[PDB]
């Protein structure tokens, strides 16, 4: 399925584990969403001369862009 939609297995697994984490109980759900915080800052280059810089705080937008 993911191979046909042009999708990686890592993306599928992460985006499904996100839903599974949403199906948790609150005391454990807090710790689960705590240990899975995401923050990145991608910086694209082309022989120096930075093309763009972009932050990511969500798994979906991190995999899409």
């Amino acid at each position: 399925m993911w191979r046909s939609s042009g999708v990686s297995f890592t993306r599928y697994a992460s985006e499904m584990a996100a839903l599974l984490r949403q199906c948790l109980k609150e005391p454990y759900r807090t710790q689960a969403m705590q240990r899975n915080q995401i923050h990145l800052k991608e910086t694209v280059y082309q022989q120096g001369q930075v093309l763009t810089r972009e932050t990511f705080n969500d798994i979906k937008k991190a995999f899409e862009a």
Binding site: R3, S8, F9, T10, R11, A13, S14, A17, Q34, R35, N36, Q37, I38, H39, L40, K41, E42, T43, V44, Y45, Q47, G48, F56, I59, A62, F63
Partner: protein
């Protein structure tokens, strides 16, 4: 493609120095034969180390990874970014954590789809793949990338 793992804060001794030293060695060794080199990095320290000398080879850099606890979701993003830019050969430079007062710098020659298609995978014939090998290999390979990044970054931290 050389993925150099490093930190973002200072006062870390000289681990990033050794990482960048090994990276310079690898680049100067592989650029003589004519292999076009690309550089991926994790942390601002490697960026500050290699900007002036090998800044015309950067492809994508990530940082602010050590703010929150390291997780598999952080590694899957970097693995996907590596796969979308599928190179012919990948190297990973990081620091192995032997003991609380001893580390060790290493370089991991990592398999790639180009290197996998060129092999019949006769070594895995002993293993019964429940789906067929051709259907499960691309997923096993993505998992391999993610796990590699995960373990390497943990040791470096």
């Amino acid at each position: 493609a050389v993925l150099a793992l490093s930190s973002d804060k200072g006062l870390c001794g000289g681990v990033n120095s050794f990482v960048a030293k090994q990276a310079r060695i690898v680049i100067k060794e592989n650029e003589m034969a004519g292999n076009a080199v690309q550089v991926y990095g994790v942390g601002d320290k490697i960026r500050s180390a290699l900007q002036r000398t090998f800044g015309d080879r950067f492809k994508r850099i990530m940082t602010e990874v050590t703010r929150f606890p390291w997780n598999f979701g952080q590694a899957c993003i970097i693995a996907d970014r590596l796969m979308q830019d599928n190179p012919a050969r990948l190297m990973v430079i990081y620091n192995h954590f032997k003991s609380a007062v001893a580390y060790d710098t290493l370089t991991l020659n990592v398999l790639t789809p180009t290197q996998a298609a060129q092999s019949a995978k006769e070594q895995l014939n002993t293993f019964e793949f429940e789906p067929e090998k051709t259907d499960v290999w691309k997923d096993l390979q993505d998992f391999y990338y993610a796990c590699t990044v995960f373990g390497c970054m943990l040791d470096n931290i």
